[PDB]
Design goal:
- The structure is cut from a larger assembly and holds 6 copies of chain A.
- By secondary structure, chain A is an all-beta fold.
- The first copy, chain A, is built from no helices and 8 strands.
- Helix content of chain A is 0%, strand content 37%.
- At the B-D interface, strand 2, strand 4 and strand 9 of B face strand 2, strand 4 and strand 9 of D.
Chain lengths: 149, 164, 163, 164, 163, 149
């Protein structure tokens, strides 16, 4: 089976491709909401659980780590405080945050960042980061936009 | 069975007024404009009053929003306006707006019944006002009026305690 | 389902007349205009009729105010009128008015349901009438009619004592 | 029979707040001061807010009035203040005042429970504020806060009718 | 008629402790001061403790805020403190504060019952603490204690998963 | 999901950074309570379960082990008697002590030590040790300090 969202909650999924990475280097990528949730009305919706997993090219060599944390002056120091890390050298390359954000809002996610690490040279678009975020269902999504505008 | 009716003419300012829902109050303020070039657009920021600019008061939920613009009796041209999110392109806000106030209609106003419902008063600072003109217009020639329904502030019926 | 409906055309002078609220009466007077420059505006102070200008009656409350203007039939163009507070700019009063009377529409009128509901007849001397015209207009071409409802005066059905 | 009691100490700003009577609301605003000479007095006019300066709103009855003054933490001297009618002599207003706020007390405030009851908001413009200083003080060194209980304005829960 | 009454003297530490309202908890932390020029004022930003600095907890509502300061016993003079919004003038915050803590009185404290009732813990980062002294005071001589009551956090009695 | 504390119990979390480590060397670090639990009144509170996990820098090479045990004359000999070890060469880098301390007090934890091991040179602050301790909730934590002091 799989994990089902609680009553009154929906799950939104999107992805973001990566840039080039150097050796023993760590990039910081900001989080961008999908356009359908970018309004001020929808930035007030609560957040439940958040799941991170990534997909590498089959020819990518070396160990790739990733996590989501708050903004840090030193990019590498994020991994010491993150509550879960997606490491490509174990059975499950995923990072589940079941309680790290439960109660924040979608507008709060713009204050977070995604940190990627690589021990070997990585070209552009080699890694794809998948983000899945559970949140309160939008209040009006079963109505047409009124015609008289 | 048919039914005959008579339609009664209505004078200006004679219709019914909208009433706020329980637990809410309506605050009003207006802002001036500056010069607009022919076939151009302007972006105008939204600034709160002083009495609603404390951390306590910027946590009040928003209801409905009304935007109506008053202009000089001698301005020639077509004026349009809307309220939307901040955009790189000022003219591109009209392509996605849910209500546009156009001066060449019978009612020059726009009602946003659901676009900003559930936001907070402090979130309103992230919205802008876009203003278009068909022909060149000078400054102060058009005034925009903004009316926001929001939760009634909790403590406005109490004197300040005397022991400071 | 669908209901058929017949709309009956009406002539001028057909239509309801608004009735004053209980305990109130309506007083009417008019003001004549002077020459107006094209694309300019005029301001003129409200003058109470001689029968309401005493201290006894300037303390009565105000309900609704109605404005309507009657033009010379030869006059053509566009005339606009409004009632507001005294303004530094004559034409700026149209940006803050809650109603404007226009001659290019079918009903040339302006109704103020709550703009002054609760003031006194003496407060009307603090207001002004603003008149705009797109073309030049000679004097005595626009007559401004005002209708005000107010609390019914209490001691007026008496003769003046002469003993 | 005797009765023993314990008196509990109270911290600053810990007492009860006064609540307005039915049908009334409280509006607040503050005004700055200018330089005061040693052993001298100043007369400060009273100006209404903008939202309460229409003919409709200057007909609202007044209830209670509270005057409390906040001053810099570094001002040396004694400061007194009162609200009274306009007078030829500024120092002579303290001889007839019903409540004087003196900075050398535990509670620095004055309550006027009956002096101005039954007047109107437009009548308040006829009153002044008198301010005394024992030693020389600079400008902006003392701010006066004024709180007026008055009848709740009738139409603040309604949207403006759209047909202008 | 007249009732006799005996007043019982109390020692320091005797007196009631205010209980937090249902559904709320109280978190306490302290801040140390630095050198203060005589007849001058200092401003210092509120820093949340590390256990409330996450996005999850900065969305909790605020009830009451209590301030009290503890001095070195050798320190003499007058110290004043208040919590307000950020001000262009450091000392102007005392003219708009709803309470001030003074060391020349018996209780050196300041209670804010409604000044911030309804804000968020993240809004406290928009406020500042202002400290004034009549004489010169060296660093680490005033310790500012803050006590804040807020909505009780919901998901904190769990271990961090490690699967 | 995650593991919830029993009735009448709360969980306190803190961390301590590491010093430099030599090759095939083992350091001993004493445990320090948070300041809010350091009083004699709060040192009498009972202890439930204790969890240890650590966060390395992504560029740290070599195998890092860690455990908490009693004071030992020989530092390395702790790993032979510890009931759980956090090894950075397996799926879960964590050490759970579900019954090793259940019944002791917080004052007893000052008699324990944390032992770290490294097979390669490690600079200062490279490892961060996270400690999570379940204990009886303090008896007075919903009251203000009385004003008249």
């Amino acid at each position: 089976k799989a994990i089902k969202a609680i009553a009154g909650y929906s799950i939104s999924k999107w992805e973001a491709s990566s840039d080039a990475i150097t050796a023993k280097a760590t990039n910081a990528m900001s989080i961008t909401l999908p356009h359908e949730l970018s309004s001020e009305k929808n930035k007030e919706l609560k957040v439940g659980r958040v799941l991170l997993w990534l997909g590498l090219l089959p020819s990518v060599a070396g160990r790739i780590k990733a996590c989501v944390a708050e903004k840090q002056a030193q990019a590498e120091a994020a991994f010491q405080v993150a509550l879960a890390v997606a490491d490509s050298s174990k059975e499950v390359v995923a990072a589940m945050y079941t309680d790290a954000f439960r109660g924040a809002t979608l507008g709060d996610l713009l204050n977070l960042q995604i940190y990627l690490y690589a021990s070997e040279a990585v070209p552009a678009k080699a890694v794809v980061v998948h983000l899945e975020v559970e949140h309160v269902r939008p209040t009006f999504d079963d109505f047409f936009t009124p015609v008289y505008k």
